[PDB]
């Protein structure tokens, strides 16, 4: 199962560390098992989550993921 | 990391005994001199970038080769690296001044400093003389500011240059 | 603030705030009223505080007023005064949160990038904040000066 | 402790101690006398605390001393009172240090794994620390009982 | 080989370039209340700018100039007058174009590296990269 | 993420003004309620698992959602439900300590509706579970601390619905 | 199942099914008839399995039915036998599927968190599945008892 | 991702019921067809590259798409086309072995239409290529194994169209 | 990412044709303008920070956006604004050297509008800042090099608006 | 091309173009006239290059035109000469662009997978480009033959 | 082998062997006798397999033995038959081990890089293993030919 999420994560640490730029506002397929820590981490960095959509899940099943 | 309190706690924990008379007296001895450490730390937090620069110029007046040709504080890249190193020494000296124990200096400064310095070609000797130029500057500045006792100021820089020290005796 | 730092650190390690952190929160929230009083006293007298600090800064450095400096024309000079006023406002903000958090978040993360994007040197700003420090310390008593002073010294630290 | 936690929290952030953290360390340094008084109160009367708390625990949870429970028999009840003595000692350490990093960093990290490997119900251990808290806060003044009950509260919270 | 020719020309005549700089400098002309301690440092730095100009000219990249004289300004701003150093480096550029000639190709290389020097003497300082860490046990540098 | 102090400072800074008397009065209100907030946070940190399991025992147990076909059926779904309720109680404690619900819509209510709608999680049943959690913790910490917990519990239920 | 596990294990490796995995699927396909016979044996006599296993469990662990335990009372004992019925149903699913991914993927992942939130001793649940295994392997032939006891063994192993 | 067995178990579990006679009959049907599925999977694993290259030789070769301007023109595009057809044959083999097309819409047909529409890939030409692949493998493994391959090939073509 | 040469080759390859006279004339035009492109790129690499700070001194300084409430208010926001303007000047230099704006919509204008709309960044003020940057660099490098810089600056402003 | 490669290589490094890369682009910009002359030499005489190279290839490797080989028959030999025409066109593109990223990025990435799916010996294709190189460098001056033979060399090297 | 693959696949997953994997190992353990019979069939008649397969290969692909090919001459044809002997030995290893990890892990990983560095057409090697498969499955019973042809099939599939 996978979530086709779309989020925008500003860093708020690039000014101190002076690193080069990664493009934010990504659209990615997250696996279901670690989508939790990923959503929590996007909330840790302070970024807004635009769209969460279950991609491959067929929701409501008990086995077969 | 350990302050003096967690040092006494780990000391009493490994035998499984409660605090006696003497443990309460040593904890009172840390808690009584706590305010003195905290005004010394605030007075250092006043002039940290000034004290680091003054200790650096006194060290370069002591050993004059490092500004000159073959020295290791040669270019401005090396000069700025040396002044940032002295800022590190003053920062963790302040941390050990507040903690009252040398475990922060052992875990975060002195463990494997000699490896980096011997590898990079950074000398260990004027590093130590600069650490105690910082110590002498801090000591006279805090003795000027009404503080009677300076043994706790004496503690961490003397430890840091007993550890980077080469034992030849 | 203090409670923001306690909440964010407890939010990292996925736990409730412990008893020592909450007791530090209590110790700040008990003496918040003295902080409210000293931020009142700093908001009152700010014109004369910025004024004497400006006078002592251009005692220490007449270089900026004179030809080739940043205080040459009175538009830039008015912004020198306005920078002083904004920094005193940020000092009262840093006092009232009980910590360095809003003053660093609003005015200290990247002062070097801004004042190199402009033309005024940062050691001049170090001397300027120290002038603001002894100016604002002449207007409060010691019971409040011990709370006022080290925020000025933290600005001095993050400048350099 | 408080000083360790402040030093580490400024240490990861690559900054010095903020002045709010510094008056936190200062307030803990001033309150150390009351902390040492609570520690002497908890240390000097440990016999009655452990005895009365074991009595009230086995009154409250009699199945762990009944045949079939963990603490059944002479030496098993002695080991049970020894575990309660360990936790009261860690309570005294956390009272002195001003934070729960002695208690957590010694006797609360793998407490579930250890007491699951021994076959011990952890809720009955939480009841043991609850009865220890009742006897201990029945032994002190009001603010002293609150300050000790904060650490007792942390131990029972870290059980479940 | 042209870069070596202009580097050998600069090395062979560095003394008169530094001497021309000396009576250009000592934006008021400097008072020479500096004394010997500031004066020997000043003479060493007016050498040293030319040294890393020559190293940059041979090496082919001006990075050896950049990584040194970028943060140089606030090291020597408590010391001395910074526009005096600016017109000193500009004058040493003029002394290089004094010294040799080309059909506007080696002069262009020399003014390129000297322009990197005058650009980096105004970049006053960048703040150092902060390795702040999220872990407690880690240390920030 | 901002408490009452940081929001007051942000309002006075977006104004560009100094802290006037209304801001001083707001900060005095927060500095009077802060000790009660601290004691309620300690009491809630005492009984996290008990409040969560009493909320499930009040609302979700013995209903259709723990039966076959329900979304709380399997042990994985039961463990994830206990995890979600522990999250709601923990962040309600954080918003009670800050005195501002900015952490709730920053870090709970951000993509929670779309996550629950993609998974098939019933929103009404979890709103009833959060309401029973609020009722249990208001029975735990008293009247006014229960009210200042229930305002953020109602914030979570309103943003979820 | 076996086919799901083989497909996924070849799927991560970016390869087709190896011939050894293919004769594994073939042998499972041939043994499906005996698997269905074991499933009918477990399905048709579920009443006696649940009844006798509950009787032997409450004989073995009487404290959970005594006042103070979890399964005390009429409806609590009915819910206890219902949980045992759930686990026997998952045993039948794992017998048919040829692997424990039905059992694990339905009723064994968060079993410790669920039974800790309910207040249930998990060792007594392991004893319940042990008595279910005793009654079930007392009901079949030798190889059938071994093949069913493999999945019963997995459930009791995943408890502790 | 579920085979016929896991889907039968999931239906009986979402019911909450035990496995009745209809589920037993479905599993008996799968356990009768499984040996034929195994032998067809081995025969398809034998001739992956041959089936792919015969599908291109039937449909895509000597047409406009391999000429300049076509989407199969360059060597990079030819290699990616052979890669895509190998994917379709491999996942059709997996769905034949499982006896359920859940892997196809889980792992092939998920974002395939939007990917092909963003790249500019012709969907009709690749549907004809998959149909020729189906025709070749049904000539390879016989009538009924070719039919139970072609049901998942038609599933891929229907989800692609 | 393609320059004028790679785009000419891609057109002749998508045709499948050889390089005829029009492609030769286009490449001759690029090979005549390339030395001017090189010298303008060196002159722009000379004065990056000066062009950026003169663009802020022309447009964004002493307006409302550097005052409280503006999006360029804090030092973090000022540093990020200088970073964004340095990005625009650097990528305009790259597109000037390539002679094709494919790098601009590949690597600047890709998600820039949605990023700026999510952050709350004013697009008109940054368009005016890029226009002042264009005016300053066209004063720096001359008429025709300033024009061939301003075509890509106008490309960035058009894709941003 | 050269400009694309320099821009990308400075682009990953988060820096501008180094001056050495800039005089590289400048030298390529000056040598573009000789590159266009080599391109007109290769373009105008493509008929004789393809004809003579096909003749020498089928003389050298007669088995691919014998019955049993790939290029057997009228249309198969026409497709073989068409593939040789494709590779000469990519040679002209790589001559103009100053680098092999047109040749590699169009007709050399999946060349082994394509010619394995067609049933083609790739060594005979390398011999075809070898004969094309012989006819083409027999058609030019010395430095022109070396500069074209660099790209012909890259194609035969990327075959094997 | 099968046991290695099952152990590793349970080993990454941090779990024990599932019962389905265990009856997979059990079925392979029972079928080891037929595997050893196929191995003796392949081992005892290796001379005729290598001889007849080389004869049919050089009949099928005569260009590699013609002057110009790789296996031209006495010692080159001897090395060609030696490479075929190597692959038949790896076929025997894969037959015994029950999986293709001996064959892949010894002689199929860098086979394209090696035979490209030697100048060898890999399709002719695939034809050599095809003729070896024809002679070997012409030598056995039906299910034995299918089980050996699975590994021969894997080798020809891993060539192309
Ligand atoms: C200055 C007075 C002396 C001096 C210093 C010098 N140091 C370096 C390089 C490094 N120094 C360190 C030091 C530390 N890292 C730590 O984490 C701590 C504890 C907090 C210390 C003390 C490290 C890691 C480096 C490597 C650079 C890096 O940080 O990545 C240099 C540069 C050496 C060079 O030539 O590159 C210099 C000049 N040298 C002197 O002469 C003085 C005695
Ligand atoms: C909220 C934190 C914060 C501050 C304070 C800030 C200041 C700031 N100071 C500016 C200019 C300036 N700042 C100064 C300040 C000084 N010159 C000196 O010699 C002294 C050392 C010093 C103060 C007395 C001067 C002279 C200018 C005008 C520079 C110019 O000519 O552009 C500008 C550009 C134009 C303007 O908006 O005024 C900003 C944005 N920006 C911020 O985000
Ligand atoms: C300082 C941190 C710390 C703790 C907590 C600790 C516990 C600890 N408890 C033990 C036993 C025990 N602890 C108990 C305690 C209890 N059983 C009950 O029913 C009651 C609820 C409860 C006490 C009130 C019992 C019964 C045993 C014996 C277990 C056995 O014999 O199997 C043992 C094994 C024997 C030993 O070496 O003492 C350890 C190590 N050790 C530590 O270093
Ligand atoms: C290769 C390029 C390069 C240069 C030039 C360089 C200079 C440099 N000049 C320094 C100091 C100094 N430089 C000067 C003087 C001057 N400075 C000038 O550029 C003027 C010519 C002159 C004044 C008219 C003085 C007086 C000091 C001592 C500053 C102090 O007390 O800290 C220092 C600090 C160490 C020292 O005392 O020498 C460095 C590293 N570093 C480099 O990497
Ligand atoms: C910190 C802010 C935050 C929250 C709240 C959050 C929730 C969240 N809850 C989830 C699942 C879940 N949440 C529930 C909860 C419920 N379903 C019911 O039937 C009940 C009514 C209700 C509980 C009271 C269940 C059962 C799942 C599992 C869904 C599944 O496994 O299919 C998931 C799916 C991924 C995973 O389980 O680990 C997320 C991301 N994530 C976050 O970052
Ligand atoms: C298919 C996987 C699966 C399992 C295992 C499951 C268990 C489960 N067991 C429950 C209760 C229970 N289960 C037990 C069972 C026991 N207590 C004992 O003492 C005995 C040792 C043991 C049984 C032999 C008891 C007593 C309760 C009631 C708990 C309570 O009322 O607080 C409940 C809450 C009420 C309900 O909705 O049924 C669930 C969801 N649900 C599932 O979907
Ligand atoms: C496992 C499930 C799955 C599939 C199927 C899949 C397909 C897929 N096919 C792609 C490209 C492609 N697919 C094709 C295929 C075709 N174009 C034609 O003209 C023919 C009609 C057709 C082949 C029969 C081509 C030519 C490309 C390359 C497009 C390009 O390079 O511009 C790409 C673009 C990225 C890349 O090549 O590596 C993806 C992601 N990805 C997946 O994860
Ligand atoms: C290389 C292509 C590229 C671009 C251009 C890019 C821009 C970009 N600009 C950003 C922020 C920003 N951009 C601006 C810029 C402006 N706001 C104003 O008021 C002015 C009108 C304008 C400057 C002229 C500001 C102030 C922020 C910070 C927003 C914030 O911190 O809240 C962010 C947010 C994350 C971060 O700061 O580090 C991104 C990703 N990213 C890219 O990958
Ligand atoms: C620009 C990059 C590029 C290349 C290289 C390319 C090759 C290419 N070569 C093909 C056929 C072919 N190419 C050859 C060529 C050869 N066989 C031999 O024996 C000789 C050694 C050799 C040529 C000298 C033959 C015989 C075929 C026909 C294959 C067949 O009919 O099965 C085909 C299939 C039919 C078509 O649409 O043309 C393609 C796509 N396409 C491209 O876009």
mmCIF file of C-alpha atoms in Angstrom, chain F residues 21 33 37 39 44 76 89 96 111 116 123 150-151:
data_model
loop_
_atom_site.group_PDB
_atom_site.id
_atom_site.type_symbol
_atom_site.label_atom_id
_atom_site.label_comp_id
_atom_site.label_asym_id
_atom_site.label_seq_id
_atom_site.Cartn_x
_atom_site.Cartn_y
_atom_site.Cartn_z
ATOM 1 C CA UNK F 21 -1.045 47.503 28.316
ATOM 2 C CA UNK F 33 -2.814 30.322 34.568
ATOM 3 C CA UNK F 37 -1.367 24.327 33.308
ATOM 4 C CA UNK F 39 -0.009 20.742 37.369
ATOM 5 C CA UNK F 44 -2.141 13.979 32.489
ATOM 6 C CA UNK F 76 -2.930 -3.958 13.837
ATOM 7 C CA UNK F 89 -4.051 13.232 24.202
ATOM 8 C CA UNK F 96 -2.784 23.137 26.973
ATOM 9 C CA UNK F 111 -3.429 16.313 6.639
ATOM 10 C CA UNK F 116 -8.497 9.331 7.475
ATOM 11 C CA UNK F 123 -14.329 10.307 11.597
ATOM 12 C CA UNK F 150 -11.600 20.480 26.538
ATOM 13 C CA UNK F 151 -11.186 23.637 24.492
#
